[PDB]
Design a protein around this motif. Structure first.
Motif, PDB file in Angstrom:
ATOM      1  N   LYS A   1       0.796  -1.212   0.000  1.00 30.86           N
ATOM      2  CA  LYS A   1       0.000   0.000   0.000  1.00 30.86           C
ATOM      3  C   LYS A   1       0.837   1.274   0.000  1.00 30.86           C
ATOM      4  N   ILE A   2       2.165   1.200   0.026  1.00 28.86           N
ATOM      5  CA  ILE A   2       2.942   2.432   0.013  1.00 28.86           C
ATOM      6  C   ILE A   2       3.223   2.827  -1.433  1.00 28.86           C
TER       7      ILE A   2
ATOM      8  N   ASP B   1       0.310   2.612  -3.762  1.00 35.77           N
ATOM      9  CA  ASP B   1      -0.957   3.033  -4.343  1.00 35.77           C
ATOM     10  C   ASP B   1      -0.924   4.555  -4.469  1.00 35.77           C
TER      11      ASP B   1
ATOM     12  N   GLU C   1      -2.484   6.731  -2.571  1.00 34.03           N
ATOM     13  CA  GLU C   1      -3.161   7.381  -1.453  1.00 34.03           C
ATOM     14  C   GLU C   1      -2.265   7.412  -0.214  1.00 34.03           C
ATOM     15  N   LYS C   2      -2.694   8.209   0.763  1.00 35.82           N
ATOM     16  CA  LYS C   2      -2.048   8.318   2.063  1.00 35.82           C
ATOM     17  C   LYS C   2      -2.955   7.764   3.160  1.00 35.82           C
TER      18      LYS C   2
ATOM     19  N   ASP D   1      -3.446   4.800   4.680  1.00 33.72           N
ATOM     20  CA  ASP D   1      -2.921   3.491   5.036  1.00 33.72           C
ATOM     21  C   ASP D   1      -1.610   3.736   5.765  1.00 33.72           C
TER      22      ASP D   1
ATOM     23  N   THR E   1       3.268   6.190   4.904  1.00 33.11           N
ATOM     24  CA  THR E   1       2.077   5.906   4.122  1.00 33.11           C
ATOM     25  C   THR E   1       2.350   5.706   2.640  1.00 33.11           C
ATOM     26  N   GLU E   2       3.381   6.350   2.095  1.00 35.74           N
ATOM     27  CA  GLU E   2       3.549   6.367   0.652  1.00 35.74           C
ATOM     28  C   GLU E   2       5.001   6.684   0.339  1.00 35.74           C
TER      29      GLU E   2
HETATM   30 CA   LIG Z   1      -0.283   4.525   0.282  1.00 37.33          CA
END
Ligand SMILES: [Ca+2]
Ligand SMILES: CC(=O)N[C@@H]1[C@@H](O)[C@H](O[C@@H]2O[C@H](CO[C@H]3O[C@H](CO[C@H]4O[C@H](CO)[C@@H](O)[C@H](O)[C@@H]4O)[C@@H](O)[C@H](O[C@H]4O[C@H](CO)[C@@H](O)[C@H](O)[C@@H]4O)[C@@H]3O)[C@@H](O)[C@H](O[C@H]3O[C@H](CO)[C@@H](O)[C@H](O)[C@@H]3O[C@H]3O[C@H](CO)[C@@H](O)[C@H](O)[C@@H]3O[C@H]3O[C@H](CO)[C@@H](O)[C@H](O)[C@@H]3O)[C@@H]2O)[C@@H](CO)O[C@H]1O
Length: 787
Positions: free
Chosen positions: A654-655, A657, A659-660, A662, A779-780
């Motif tokens: 998920k880092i 995708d 988005e932040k 997660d 997160t990302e």
């Molecule tokens: Ca993410």
């Protein structure tokens, strides 16, 4: 016939011939013919048969009366006949649970189209036909203990619509009434929204105070929504008489409290909420249909004193007014005669609307009562050549659209003949006004002349559209329509300032709907610039006449027709211009880094993408270049697939995708994710969105990565697939097999730095420490470059 009588009664109620209505709910267990499950009489003191003619509609409200009770045949063979003789219709009340699966016949039919169709007919037969009454009333309240499901409400609506095909104004048997009574506002009443077109009346229970100093806040704010589904003439509001042994939660004080010094006090309506509901009228739409009472068999009993309002089932505080007694319906009779004497229900007559053709069309569209005039707030279409005068039209003060169609015999229109709402942008349409001689719209703040068919006004001898909000600029369509009206006056008379008045305009300002600059430029001048000032600025008129700044407005004010300057002399730019108060500028550098500022300092070649927002929506998008610009980078790490991690494979994914929303962390202060960009390109910068960027859970900075290192596979020669899983994982964990391309040593919310033009298909980022003892999160992860 007993069916024909009820049929005519119902038709007269539905056609509005009773004036304001008074209705009451009669509790069946207080009719002397009622018997309980034990077959014994419950209360001998009262009977529905004595309900007086001032009660237009009497609702049968059922409880405790047993199915085999003599009451049912007494109702059907006796009460209905005698109440019909005096003009009173009978309506059976049932609860929504009879329709949604929870009780009665509802439990015996499936929730299917044919099952609900069949349920509706069984309901009509059991509760209307078999009982001998004139209609059906569905009681829909809030279920506090066990909320109703959307499927339960959806079904009751489907059954209700099927009932509406059997009875009511849209049913095959139009001799029966179809009614809802409710405690639910529009937003909490999905069934009402779906059935409202098929209802004769909506009975809104309003027992007890309803907020504010006049105690009617909830009624007014509810009516503001209800009006979009029913007419005011369909709206009944309700108060409650005092029910014996009522406890906390069923103590409304809608009538006067006990007076030991005056046994008649309960029969006095002065001061009571009941009287207030009799007198209340909606402020828009029209006059209401009337009022109703719950527990009309308790009419006249004084309310238990306020000191008792805390008694409960287990804390009894019995009072003399808890006794049952015979009523003679004195309060009901007073409330009905109060309403019928309300002069707002006098019919519109020659003295409101002198012109009989005008009067007829108004009555057909706004209602029959004088009180409807100042409340009607929808649309009025006046047509034909029989209308000669518009006197009285000013009385529809809240009309929101006036439509004058082919009124060939109307010679005059003036503000004094026009509703006050014309000063507040009410719509004004007039077509084929071939007789009109004087057109006076001065002082109405009209923002355009749209809707005025100036070509047809072939007889105009004077007009005055001065003191409006018109844009009479060269390009404005309202300047062109003005000229047609000046040509019409010319065909009859020498034009003068007075017979073609159009001065003192104050056009209102609007945001332009688009902005011209799709690609801006600054030189590398080492100076600050404001992107709003330079690219997203200005005000338009209703006709989209652009005014960029103050001197463009000073130019505008000198605009003139035949030498007459039409903009009011005292009208200032600050009164016209849009302040850009809430405006925010969102910048995306070639970095992909994001900032929110309208100011840029042109120090080096750069390219932003610019999204301007007004606080709620994006109003403009453009590219801004500084000097030569700079090519936008791609997030080359987007969607990269995870090849190994000391944490959870699926949270590692998920880092990458977009988005932040997660977080990735491990059971400790250090971890790593190794990832495969798939391709191989040139990486120039990297970005890590730290723990506090979490959009799905407000995360404090103590969870931030504080140390870490971004690395490259430092081999390029090896095949990952050649290893099997255990050693693969082990290789990718070995510090020796990676070389640092960037180091991080500050727990910044967003960390960005450059890479010496790295390119590696395989990467690994290592968290080495956190802002605190908490497990560090991020997160990302972004790797930024070309191709
Ligand atoms: Ca993410
Ligand atoms: C338009 C309006 O105002 N509507 C409501 C209204 O409900 C409310 O007034 C109250 O109404 C109560 C009746 O509702 C309950 O019962 C009905 C009937 O259901 C039965 O019968 C059906 C007929 O087929 C069956 O199908 C059904 O299965 C039941 O067997 C229910 O339909 C109703 O449904 C509930 O849930 C739905 C869910 O969607 C909801 O929409 C409804 O709103 C409702 O919440 C209820 O279950 C009525 O019982 C109240 O009166 C009582 O209290 C008064 C004081 O507060 C008192 O003066 C009155 O006499 C009643 O007191 C008797 O009943 C109590 C409860 O049973 C006892 O505790 C008392 O001791 C007393 O019984 C004694 O006396 C009687 C004779 O007097 C005797 O026969 C007994 O044997 C015993 O000795 C109240 O009128 C209204 C006003 O607040 O506002 C709106 O909410």
């Amino acid at each position: 016939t007993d069916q024909q009588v009820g049929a005519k009664l119902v038709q007269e109620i539905r056609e509005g011939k009773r004036g304001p209505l008074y209705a009451g709910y009669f509790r069946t267990w207080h009719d002397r013919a009622s018997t309980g499950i034990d077959g014994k009489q419950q209360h001998p003191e009262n009977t529905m048969a004595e309900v007086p003619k001032e009660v237009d509609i009497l609702f049968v409200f059922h409880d405790h009366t047993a199915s085999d009770s003599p009451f049912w045949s007494e109702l059907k063979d006796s009460y209905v006949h005698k109440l019909h003789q005096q003009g009173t219709a009978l309506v059976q009340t049932i609860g929504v649970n009879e329709l949604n699966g929870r009780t009665g016949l509802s439990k015996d039919y499936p929730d299917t189209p044919e099952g609900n169709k069949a349920l509706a007919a069984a309901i009509v037969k059991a509760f209307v036909t078999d009982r001998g009454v004139d209609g059906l009333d569905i009681d829909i309240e809030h279920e506090f203990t066990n909320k109703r499901t959307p499927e339960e409400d959806a079904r009751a609506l489907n059954v209700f619509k099927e009932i509406a095909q059997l009875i009511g104004k849209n049913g095959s048997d139009k001799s029966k009434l179809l009614i809802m009574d409710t405690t639910l506002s529009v937003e909490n009443n999905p069934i009402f929204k779906g059935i409202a077109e098929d209802l004769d009346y909506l009975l809104r229970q309003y027992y007890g105070s309803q907020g504010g100093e006049a105690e009617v806040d909830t009624i007014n704010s509810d009516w503001n929504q209800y009006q979009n589904y029913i007419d005011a003439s369909q709206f009944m509001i309700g108060f409650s008489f005092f029910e014996e042994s009522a406890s906390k939660g069923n103590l409304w004080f809608d009538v006067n409290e006990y007076d030991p010094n005056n046994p008649e006090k309960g029969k006095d309506i002065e001061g009571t909420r009941a009287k207030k509901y009799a007198e209340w009228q909606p402020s828009t739409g029209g006059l209401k249909a009337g009022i109703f009472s719950y527990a009309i068999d308790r009419d006249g009993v004084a309310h238990v004193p306020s000191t008792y309002k805390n008694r409960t089932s287990t804390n009894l505080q019995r009072h003399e007014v808890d006794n049952i007694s015979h009523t003679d319906y004195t309060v009901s009779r007073k409330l009905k005669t109060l309403m019928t004497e309300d002069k707002r229900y006098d019919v519109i007559d020659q003295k409101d609307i002198p012109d009989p053709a005008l009067r007829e069309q108004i009555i057909q569209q706004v209602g029959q009562y004088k009180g409807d005039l100042e409340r009607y707030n929808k649309t009025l279409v006046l047509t034909g050549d029989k209308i000669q005068n518009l006197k009285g039209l000013e009385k529809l003060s809240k009309l929101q659209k006036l439509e004058l169609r082919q009124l060939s015999n109307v010679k005059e229109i003036t503000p004094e003949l026009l509703p006050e709402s014309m000063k507040k942008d009410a719509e004004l349409v007039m077509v084929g006004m071939t007789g009109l001689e004087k057109l006076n719209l001065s002082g109405l703040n009209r923002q355009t002349l749209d809707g005025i068919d100036v070509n047809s006004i072939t007889h105009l001898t004077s007009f005055d559209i001065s003191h409006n909000s018109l844009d009479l600029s060269e390009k404005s369509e309202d300047r062109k329509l003005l000229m047609t009206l000046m040509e019409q006056v010319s065909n009859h008379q020498k034009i003068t300032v007075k017979n073609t008045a159009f001065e003192n305009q104050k056009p209102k300002g609007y945001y332009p709907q688009t902005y011209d600059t799709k690609e801006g430029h600054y030189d590398v001048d080492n100076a600050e610039h404001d992107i709003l000032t330079d690219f997203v600025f200005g005000t338009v008129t209703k006709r989209n006449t652009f005014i960029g700044d103050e001197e463009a407005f000073a130019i505008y004010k000198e605009g003139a027709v035949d030498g007459r300057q039409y903009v009011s002399k005292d009208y200032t730019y600050e009164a016209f211009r849009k302040d850009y108060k809430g405006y925010k500028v969102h910048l995306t550098a070639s970095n992909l880094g994001e900032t929110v500022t309208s100011k840029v300092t042109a120090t080096t070649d750069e390219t932003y993408l610019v999204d301007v927002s007004d606080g709620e929506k994006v109003v403009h998008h453009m590219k801004l270049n500084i000097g030569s610009g700079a090519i936008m980078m791609e997030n080359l790490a987007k969607g990269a697939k995870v090849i190994g991690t000391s944490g959870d494979f699926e949270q590692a994914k998920k880092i990458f995708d977009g988005e932040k929303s997660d977080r990735f962390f491990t059971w400790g202060q250090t971890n790593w994710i190794a990832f495969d960009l798939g391709e191989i390109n040139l990486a120039k910068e990297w970005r890590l969105f730290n723990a506090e960027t979490n959009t799905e859970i407000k995360t404090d900075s103590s969870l931030n990565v504080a140390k870490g290192r971004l690395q490259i596979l430092k081999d390029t020669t090896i095949d990952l697939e050649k290893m099997d899983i255990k050693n693969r994982k082990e290789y990718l964990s070995n510090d020796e097999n990676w070389t640092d391309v960037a180091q991080m040593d500050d727990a910044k919310a967003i960390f960005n730095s450059k890479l010496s033009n790295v390119l590696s298909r395989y990467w690994r980022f290592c968290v080495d420490g956190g802002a605190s003892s908490y497990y560090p999160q991020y997160t990302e992860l972004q790797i930024l470059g070309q191709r």
